[PDB]
Design a protein around this ligand. Structure first.
Ligand SMILES: CC1(C)O[C@@H]2O[C@H](CO[C@H]3O[C@H](CO[C@H]4O[C@H](CO[C@H]5O[C@H](CO)[C@@H](O)[C@@H]5O)[C@@H](O)[C@@H]4O)[C@@H](O)[C@@H]3O)[C@@H](O)[C@@H]2O1
Ligand SMILES: CC1(C)O[C@@H]2O[C@H](CO[C@H]3O[C@H](CO[C@H]4O[C@H](CO[C@H]5O[C@H](CO)[C@@H](O)[C@@H]5O)[C@@H](O)[C@@H]4O)[C@@H](O)[C@@H]3O)[C@@H](O)[C@@H]2O1
Ligand SMILES: OC[C@H]1O[C@H](OC[C@H]2O[C@H](OC[C@H]3O[C@H](OC[C@H]4O[C@H](O)[C@@H](O)[C@@H]4O)[C@@H](O)[C@@H]3O)[C@@H](O)[C@@H]2O)[C@@H](O)[C@@H]1O
Ligand SMILES: [Ca+2]
Ligand SMILES: [Ca+2]
Ligand code: NA
Ligand code: NA
Lengths: 479, 479
């Protein structure tokens, strides 16, 4: 939809330009999902779906025959400072220097083409990773699974076995093919969808210590929790996709994220069986085309909600953030209009929620041309100060955080990114020189005694033919 | 010298192709030294000299006018697993996304062209960083300093102040311009050289809590520790350079590392004042041209000696390792001859400590063409198995660790790195596909009942015009 996107892009976690350098360290050049859980020992484990190495070019998933296709890979983080990204400090390797597939697949189309992680959790000293055995793929949002399964590891994710526990997909409509686990107290709630993205979500619950025992599951049947899976009823209507569910102590609500139709949405509930509050836009397909996934970071707290988002054309995973109040309502949204430049192929005059720029400037538009999406802004010249800017309404006296991703021609020597008055006087800014990789810059400032500022990025071009590119600009209130 | 290099390259820590991606994270594209210390709070702080960003090309230090020249930068590590590299987890930034200069300099040639870190330590909750004020550079190994200073930080390296404590260099021959600190008991021993690389080392000591108080220093004069800096006599003869000293609990010895003439060497002592045992070669200029630095990692233990080494042409810092026994003798040296391919410009026949390869192959030779140095081996064809190999003498029944750095053309699909019998039967190997960045591969194997193996790397080349490059191959006994 054209709904506004409250969420902010924090970092590209995987693939080209990613700070993490998954490509260099582990031959993770392109991948998706980024399903996260707390390993019970001070770390976050993060699992990915179909992963490709050095020869991948994109756009999209898929690679040449030498693409080092693994159905899945796993990395670890110990990073508690998510505002500045999420550093991966380890990966399951084999050989060393290459992230290995941890849940094997046959890679025979129409039998089992791949095995894709869905959700993860730890109980005591055991890690568990839910997955789906994919028989074959159809058009977007459509695929067939053989079963949902569970792998486990007793050494923090170093080595894995596949358990015998499965939800078989007898008739293609089994409701627990694609799962999402949340633990509260001594109980794991297991949400499930059918294969693909056109069906509803169901829920079951199991004592945390009995996750591998299907007979210990009880299924919400609309009145109570019963033994038969075939009694399960939907708790959230179709259409729903891959899902993530987190218990947020701050708001005393379960939060659920999913791609529903076009957009990633969030709903909230005081109990897993519902009632689930109406969908709130997290990210729209207009701002983040061919987005999918959406998995909560397990160290979210205090109303700060970090999550991983996938996107088809760049075929890589981004860390995202949004904020909620104590009722689970999204607050302090990105106030920048058209933050990812995806909504227009030209510039405006900088007013009324449009971007402006000096000559020579425009929107580059091609598959995965953006930092995210297919669009980015540019400005280029060979004389004087050359910038890109947008007027943004603000609350006088409030403090703001401005983040954005930019890069320059190698011969760039002086650029700035920041906020200024509508008269052009800088309020807060930083100074960059030559920027190779897409790089996030971050500026926090007081809006002061005014109802609007101009967010901007630009380069001095006195020294030569110099360009800057820009994407995914966010202005959000600081609390 | 042409002496053999016992040390093994572990990882490139900074710059292009480094796993750490200091370039993308922090605009640390090229830099030197990598002076390390324990910050007292479970981390290693690492300081660097003159640092350049995105526009740097090399070879060597210096950059274009937009090269984001900083006199120094500082990163952090929490990494206890040095066998697979040293992950940096933070850098002192400003703006965020750019590692900043932490010790200012005037950058006026003949006054103060730069400020270079020399050594660091923590005492309680304070970090200290020694540095030299550089007035002007001369030819290699020669420069003039104004003084040695000490900067300090009370917030774990986040912010820095330059103290008023200085060793001034009125006549150019002050013996403590370039310091190396080591703490044992509550005493810091302060080793010192003149400016540049042609003089001897002296030693001073100070109670750890009084590092900033020059009146608390005592200076070894050959008979006792006295109050006057002018009484200090050499404890180690010229020529010596930048230095590192570590107290090794394993050997109950102080270890000293420095570039002495052409080679990085190590000496040992049971007391800081000496006597210092004769120089042992760590890395020779023949294998590692224009090497310098050599700083011990503070978490060295059990005889495993990790250290950082700089090298001019790639102008970046590498983690290295060697092993000692309980007497402080280097043991278990790299058994591969001409490990970095620098000693010859053409291939041999694989015997007598030479490299061989199948057509089309040779030694690439250009400034900073190596992973390290100017040389790397290459093999390239479009048919069959195409490899680079060397016969290496082994001890029957012993276990060995083979590491080496390689990369491939993007269209590579299947290569192997490992050890095999002289008759070509693999003993242990790994399988790689397409390798973009220089990447280290690691193989451990039993030599079994034989006293030679062939170490190799190669690519299958049926799928196209495929090449592999290879550098810094090491085979060392496992303990
Ligand atoms: C055919 C396909 C999907 O499977 C093969 O395996 C590789 C990719 O695998 C990753 O993709 C799976 C998810 O696939 C769904 O998501 C795609 C993108 O969705 C976004 O774009 C569409 C179009 O508007 C919207 O649905 C959404 O916003 C969609 O096309 C797929 O149905 C993961 O499970 C797996 O890890 C490729 O080599 C190849 O692609
Ligand atoms: C002029 C110089 C050195 O300083 C300017 O700032 C940048 C580089 O600075 C780093 O260089 C210093 C060390 O410089 C010495 O090391 C060089 C390399 O040594 C190897 O080559 C020679 C000959 O084989 C041997 O001494 C050794 O094996 C040598 O030329 C220098 O004297 C660090 O303190 C500093 O951070 C450049 O822009 C420029 O270079
Ligand atoms: O890949 C990086 C970006 O390149 C593409 O840039 C598109 C822009 O390039 C042209 O503008 C740059 C062009 O203008 C400047 O020179 C202009 C000359 O015109 C007058 O005669 C003189 O004042 C001046 O010398 C110089 O910087 C260069 O030649 C323009 O066609 C377009 O807007 C982007 O798509 C990428 O992001
Ligand atoms: Ca975009
Ligand atoms: Ca070399
Ligand atoms: Na972080
Ligand atoms: Na490591």
């Amino acid at each position: 939809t054209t709904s506004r996107t409250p969420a902010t892009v924090v970092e590209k976690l995987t693939g080209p330009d990613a700070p993490n350098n998954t490509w260099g360290r582990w031959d993770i050049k392109a991948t998706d999902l980024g399903i996260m859980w707390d390993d019970g020992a001070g770390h976050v484990l993060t699992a990915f779906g179909n992963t490709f190495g050095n020869s991948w070019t994109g756009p999209g998933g898929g690679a040449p025959p030498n693409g080092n296709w693994r159905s899945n890979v796993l990395v670890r983080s110990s990073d508690g400072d998510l505002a500045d990204g999420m550093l991966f400090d380890w990966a399951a390797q084999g050989p060393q220097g290459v992230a290995r597939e941890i849940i094997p697949s046959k890679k025979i189309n129409g039998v089992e083409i791949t095995t894709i992680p869905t959700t993860g959790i730890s109980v005591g000293k055991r890690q568990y990773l839910g997955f789906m055995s994919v028989k074959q793929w159809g058009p977007p949002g459509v695929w067939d699974t053989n079963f949902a399964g569970i792998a486990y590891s007793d050494d923090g994710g170093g080595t894995w076995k596949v358990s015998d526990t499965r939800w078989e997909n007898a008739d293609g409509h089994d409701p627990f093919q694609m799962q999402a686990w949340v633990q509260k107290g001594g109980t794991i709630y297991v949400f499930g969808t059918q294969n693909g993205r056109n069906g509803p979500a169901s829920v079951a619950k199991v004592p945390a210590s009995k996750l591998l025992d299907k007979s210990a599951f009880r299924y919400w049947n609309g009145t109570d929790w019963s033994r038969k899976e075939s009694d399960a009823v939907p708790v959230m209507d179709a259409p729903m996709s891959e899902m993530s569910v987190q218990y947020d102590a701050y708001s005393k609500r379960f939060l659920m994220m999913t791609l529903s139709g076009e957009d990633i949405i969030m709903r909230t509930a005081t109990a897993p069986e519902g009632p689930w509050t109406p969908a709130q836009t997290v990210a729209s397909s207009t701002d983040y085309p061919a987005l999918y996934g959406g998995y909560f970071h397990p160290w979210n707290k205090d109303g700060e909600i970090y999550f991983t988002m996938s996107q088809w054309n760049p075929y890589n995973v981004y860390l995202m953030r949004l904020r909620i109040d104590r009722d689970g309502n999204i607050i302090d949204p990105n106030l920048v209009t058209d933050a990812s430049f995806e909504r227009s192929t030209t510039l405006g005059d900088g007013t009324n929620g449009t971007w402006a720029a000096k000559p020579n400037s425009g929107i580059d538009n091609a598959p995965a041309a953006g930092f995210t999406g297919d669009h980015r802004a540019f400005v280029r010249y060979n004389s004087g100060w050359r910038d890109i800017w947008q007027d943004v309404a603000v609350e006088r006296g409030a403090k703001y955080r401005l983040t954005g991703f930019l890069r320059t021609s190698v011969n760039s020597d002086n650029g700035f990114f920041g906020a200024r008055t509508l008269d052009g006087v800088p309020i807060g800014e930083i100074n960059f020189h030559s920027v190779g990789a897409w790089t996030r810059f971050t500026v926090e400032f007081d809006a002061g005694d005014r109802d609007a500022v101009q967010v901007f990025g630009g380069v001095w071009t006195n020294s030569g033919d110099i360009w800057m590119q820009l994407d995914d600009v966010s202005l959000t209130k600081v609390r």
